[PDB]
Design a protein around this ligand. Structure first.
Ligand code: 0MO
Ligand code: 0MO
Ligand code: CO
Ligand code: MG
Ligand code: MG
Ligand code: ZN
Ligand code: ZN
Lengths: 334, 335
């Protein structure tokens, strides 16, 4: 198979090259990347992130195996889901890539831990059906039964992500040792399960406790002594990345908002057709797009990022300012 | 439990939908219009209307709310981003089957249970289709090809999904069938859905042809099928004909069907090319003749199938055959 310059075929290589200049920045526009990559934002961004961090050489991952797996992974996100499609995966992965580079975390994580974080981020919503856990529980679906109603989707994303390693020429981890594969798998499971919003309040309270007794070295770089603390930081980092839409430039944030509301509204419509209770914010006749975002920021997103900014102080100050400006925009657009 | 709309589904174009639905029992029904006027819920709409039309809810004691919940659940398991094998195709095949069941030469031949089975089989026959052929699933070593030992991989999956969905909340439309009836329906549905696997076409058609050559007709010119073997044979071919009915519909619909199957094929080809796989037949957008392919499809598969069907039901399908021949000419003179 052909391995194109940026991992995917493109009719607009120069415009794509120009956006990829921003690979390592919060200000990257993944929507442009997606347009210029013919819809393959996940395969493109993951290829580039992997080349950037030299991960193929570091783990002896054959390049065609990497691309085969990434295409397979991307193909198992549904294009007909308005928000939880591969563009969201790509965005969360890219955001995780930037967050990994934060100065307060310099030289803290091993390449294996980094590998785990990025893989977790890429697979974290694979095969999302565009309806919430509660919808699967209320319909008595096979998936809710399979996972005892507990983190139904997050369990499924993990099973699908690892299972796809078994399709032809897809085992990107073939050259990791046993201990390496086991440690990565354990870390990935931990990170993806922590993306379940029902764990959000628990996650935030523990992040706070950890921040209270944080240790900094000479130059304000974090000291993470033990596994427990390292995976705590990584699970919260992927969570922050998942909830990073309101921290991005308003132009991008507004596109993410339209997408989530389209997805929620379609769920609400399906609920109404089936005689089910309509889930929170899923009723198009009564929901306010702008008020929902304000409440979302005030009670979920800002308290999370404020605690994160505390952890990595002063590295995330800008994100917090942006977050405050965006709250104000939605508050005024009411 | 829920308030059942007049035509089974919510609509802001109720009168336009009512007009199209007058053609429910006809080959000339335009399902694309039904879809537009039923907010994209073609499968739920048409299936509801057919079940009322044949009084199947009362005959099998199927609660309406249960029927509707199942139908919406089934239709939602067809993918919208798949150009051809979406719920519109299922709606189409179901409605065609419904018309083929009513064909004068088959009058009083099938029980209500056999009719229920045929319609259920048609409605579920492609559910959860990923938009790629069996060979793509086999070549990629997918979980499904492994489960089913590379044999009718998709068709087995359609069956598994269609049946499993009965177990979702308030979805068991067969709750009031007896145990014998359930077993018999299950078996018939399996045979019909598996017969939609194109690698079976040759044997289905050879079997149908043999039946035509020794067919028995009653007093009125109505077909005589004494035994089950013959009946499931005709049902299998009927659902296969319906699945292969696009070239037999008015040209305007047939052309839309062709546009859709090529978009789906080219997408598969694009994915094969990305993966460095050998590109499946007619899936290369760079080197394909849409018109020749349609001509080949009719010449080698569709016309021998429909000619043999028309011979079985003679003369009820004469018009279907004429349209087919005219549509073939069009794609031929459009080469
Ligand atoms: C309904 C509006 C209030 C919430 O908005 C959003 C909510 C999410 C959370 C989704 C749901 N569960 C998740 O794991 N992620 C993401 C982006 C949003 O807006 C841009
Ligand atoms: C590639 C063009 C030649 C074939 O065209 C068609 C082929 C099908 C058959 C599909 C493929 N497998 C099936 O089980 N059903 C249906 C409609 C078509 O066109 C209108
Ligand atoms: Co899809
Ligand atoms: Mg998720
Ligand atoms: Mg099929
Ligand atoms: Zn997510
Ligand atoms: Zn079909």
């Amino acid at each position: 198979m052909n391995i194109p310059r940026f991992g995917v075929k493109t009719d607009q290589e120069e415009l794509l090259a120009q956006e990829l200049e921003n690979l390592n920045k919060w200000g990257l526009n993944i929507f442009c990347v997606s347009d210029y990559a013919g819809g393959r934002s996940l395969t493109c961004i993951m290829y580039m992130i992997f080349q950037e961090r030299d991960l193929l050489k570091k783990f002896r991952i054959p390049v065609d195996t990497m691309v085969t797996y990434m295409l397979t992974l991307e193909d198992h996100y549904h294009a007909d889901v308005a928000y939880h499609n591969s563009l969201h995966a790509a965005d969360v992965l890219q955001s995780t890539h930037v967050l990994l580079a934060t100065p307060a975390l310099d030289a803290v994580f091993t390449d294996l831990e980094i590998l785990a974080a990025l893989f977790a981020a890429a697979i974290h919503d694979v095969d999302h059906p565009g309806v919430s856990n509660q919808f699967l529980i209320n319909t008595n679906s096979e998936l809710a039964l399979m996972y005892n109603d507990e983190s139904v989707l997050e369990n499924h994303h993990l099973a699908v992500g690892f299972k796809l390693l078994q399709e032809d020429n897809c085992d990107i981890f073939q050259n990791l040792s046993k201990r390496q594969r086991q440690s990565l798998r354990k870390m990935v499971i931990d990170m993806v399960l922590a993306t379940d919003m029902s764990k959000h309040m628990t996650l935030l309270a523990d992040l706070k406790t950890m921040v209270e007794t944080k240790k900094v070295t000479s130059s304000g770089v974090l000291l993470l002594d033990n596994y427990s603390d390292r995976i705590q930081v990584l699970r919260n980092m992927v969570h922050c990345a998942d909830l990073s839409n309101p921290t991005k430039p308003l132009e991008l944030y507004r596109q993410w908002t339209d997408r989530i509301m389209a997805e929620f509204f379609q769920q609400g419509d399906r609920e109404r057709e089936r005689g089910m209770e309509i889930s929170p914010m899923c009723d198009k006749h009564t929901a306010s797009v702008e008020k929902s975002q304000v409440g979302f920021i005030d009670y979920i997103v800002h308290p999370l990022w404020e605690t994160w900014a505390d952890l990595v102080h002063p590295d995330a100050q800008e994100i917090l300012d942006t977050l405050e400006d965006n709250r104000d925009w939605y508050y005024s657009a009411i």
